[PDB]
């Protein structure tokens, strides 16, 4: 098992090594559109871009660029849209992508300001009396309600196509206690958060892809998605044993780059997946336990 | 203290983060000579080259290239020559550099074959009846004696300038139990190894620079040198408190790139430096304890 492997790497202390084999093994595809001199101000980080084959295109006539990737997962039967923390100039685009892609949930795995540095624009409203209007993309965003917990918050926002006065409910899952280049507090907190997202009905096939982001849309984002896709497969084959995470990860790094930024985030992914199966494999209590462990109060 | 800081990063789990700040902060200088199409076969790794300003030049008339860097340390008052694991075609050069630079010790922090892959040429003889002759550089290398331990080995080799029949004794310190992208077994084993090198008289100012290498001459090599230079300073100012390792490291990454390859190697460097001072600050027992702990039998 992966539990065997985890037990083994842990003993050898081969996390960094195993992770460089993964880094050396990841795909590399063009990101030509991302580097166009014109799309320069549309990218938060110089070194993190979407592969052209998998980039999401804005149905905008003008420019169709947005640093975002469609991670489509064949076997798992699940797709996620990973993207960077929108910039002051790209929140209109971010919301446009959510509208066009028909997403129902948004998973923000980062905080707007982290260790003195800005990582993401305040792309949604904090108070219901102040909706936002993204003039460029012709959409209105309003806060309908929040549900603040210890380390995370779920918000029900309403997005409207000013152009058609059509309206939609977007669930927002904001994980506030996961540091940049860091790991979640424990498998409990993470697993408790995933499952909240899962129950929201947000990761559901009847909707467009869940949009997952962090500052660059690769570290915490790859980690979030890695753990969830692996649990998916284990179920799809409710014979967990046959799940190779490193391989799941390599399949995922074909759609977007750098999914999983640190060896420890890789080690974490194992802990989280291993713990998870306890539930998938059958254990009921575990879920209820994660909630306690997650100290969501 | 760094012990305070270590205690702090450990609690926050900010090793990867702190290390990227270091990675983002490191210098970048040309490596133009390293990339000359002609010097291609003189480099083990495509991505690890010496900065031109600090590269070591072979007093060879032909080509003067060798992927090696002179880490000169002002305050510490110590210089090390970090280089890659010589290639089949560059052991003549490696020995030439040792001769011209007048080094007395060689610290090999890697094994020739690691996890099924070759990392370094058998650049020295394993048996006394079989000396080596590097025809290109006109030098003869012979094994005079070895001292095999659990995890390391010291060899006394004799190198001769066939050209002048002049001869020299080169102490070779081979650390065999430090994995690629890995850490030494414990602060005990490391500290016990450094100190052996230290006593050999090899790190002594009356000789040319100690040549330290691993496969690329940056990970285990940066770690080895980081820990030693920090202990140097702490002594030079026997007011340990004022030693910033991250800064020592940044000063070191000005002479050669990537010195310290992983967050854990960074965390290790702290443990090792912290432990070390116990001895520098005065504790005698500690040394003798490291020997025991190092299980050098």
């Amino acid at each position: 098992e992966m539990e065997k492997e985890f037990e083994q790497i842990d003993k050898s202390g081969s996390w960094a090594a195993i992770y460089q084999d993964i880094r050396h093994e990841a795909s590399d595809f063009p990101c030509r559109v991302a580097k166009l001199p014109k799309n320069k101000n549309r990218n938060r980080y110089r070194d993190v871009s979407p592969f052209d084959h998998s980039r999401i295109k804005l149905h905008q006539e003008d420019n169709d660029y947005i640093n975002a990737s469609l991670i489509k997962m064949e076997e798992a039967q699940r797709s996620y849209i990973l993207t960077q923390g929108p910039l002051p100039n790209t929140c209109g685009h971010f919301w446009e992508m959510v509208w066009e892609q028909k997403s129902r949930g948004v998973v923000m795995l980062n905080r707007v300001m982290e260790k003195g540095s800005l990582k993401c624009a305040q792309y949604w409203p904090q108070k219901e009396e102040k909706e936002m209007i993204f003039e460029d993309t012709n959409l209105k965003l309003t806060l309908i309600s929040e549900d603040i917990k210890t380390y995370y918050t779920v918000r029900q926002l309403e997005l409207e196509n000013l152009t058609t006065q059509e309206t939609r409910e977007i669930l927002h899952f904001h994980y506030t206690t996961w540091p940049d280049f860091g790991v979640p507090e424990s498998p409990a907190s993470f697993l408790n958060f995933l499952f909240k997202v899962r129950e929201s009905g947000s990761l559901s096939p009847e909707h467009g892809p869940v949009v997952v982001h962090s500052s660059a849309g690769i570290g915490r984002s790859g980690t979030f998605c890695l753990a969830d896709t692996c649990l998916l497969l284990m179920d799809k084959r409710k014979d967990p044993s046959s799940v190779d995470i490193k391989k799941v990860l390599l399949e995922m790094r074909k759609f977007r780059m750098g999914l999983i930024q640190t060896a420890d985030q890789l080690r974490f992914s194992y802990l989280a997946v291993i713990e998870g199966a306890k539930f998938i494999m059958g254990d009921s209590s575990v879920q209820d336990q994660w909630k306690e462990l997650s100290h969501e109060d | 203290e760094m012990e305070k800081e270590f205690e702090q990063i450990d609690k926050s789990g900010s090793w990867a983060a702190i290390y990227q700040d270091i990675r983002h902060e490191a210098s970048d200088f040309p490596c133009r000579v390293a990339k000359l199409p002609k010097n291609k076969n003189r480099n083990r790794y495509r991505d690890v080259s010496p900065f031109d300003h600090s590269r070591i030049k072979l007093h060879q008339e032909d080509n003067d290239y060798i992927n090696a860097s002179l880490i000169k340390m002002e305050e510490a008052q110590r210089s090390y020559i970090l280089t890659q694991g010589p290639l089949p075609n560059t052991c003549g050069h490696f020995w030439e550099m040792v001769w011209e630079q007048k080094s007395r010790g060689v610290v090999m922090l890697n094994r020739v074959m690691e996890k099924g892959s070759l990392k370094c040429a058998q650049y020295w003889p394993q048996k006394e009846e079989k000396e080596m002759i590097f025809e290109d550089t006109n030098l003869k290398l012979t094994l005079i004696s070895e001292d095999i331990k659990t995890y390391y080995t010291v060899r006394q080799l004799e190198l001769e300038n066939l050209t002048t029949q002049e001869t020299r004794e080169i102490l070779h310190f081979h650390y065999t139990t430090w994995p690629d992208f890995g850490v030494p077994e414990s602060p005990a084993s490391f500290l016990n190894f450094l100190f052996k090198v230290r006593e050999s008289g090899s790190l002594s100012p009356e000789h040319g620079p100690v040549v330290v290498h691993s496969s690329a001459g940056i990970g285990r090599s940066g770690t080895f040198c980081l820990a030693d230079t920090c202990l140097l300073l702490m002594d030079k100012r026997k007011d340990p408190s004022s030693v910033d390792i991250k800064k020592v490291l940044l000063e070191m990454r000005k002479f050669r790139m990537g010195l310290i390859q992983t967050a854990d190697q960074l965390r290790f460097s702290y443990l090792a430096v912290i432990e070390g001072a116990k001895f520098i600050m005065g504790d005698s027992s500690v040394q003798d304890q490291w020997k025991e702990l190092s299980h050098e039998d």
Partner: peptide, 6 residues
Amino acid sequence: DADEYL
């Protein structure tokens, strides 16, 4: 400098 994440 600023620009990078990796």
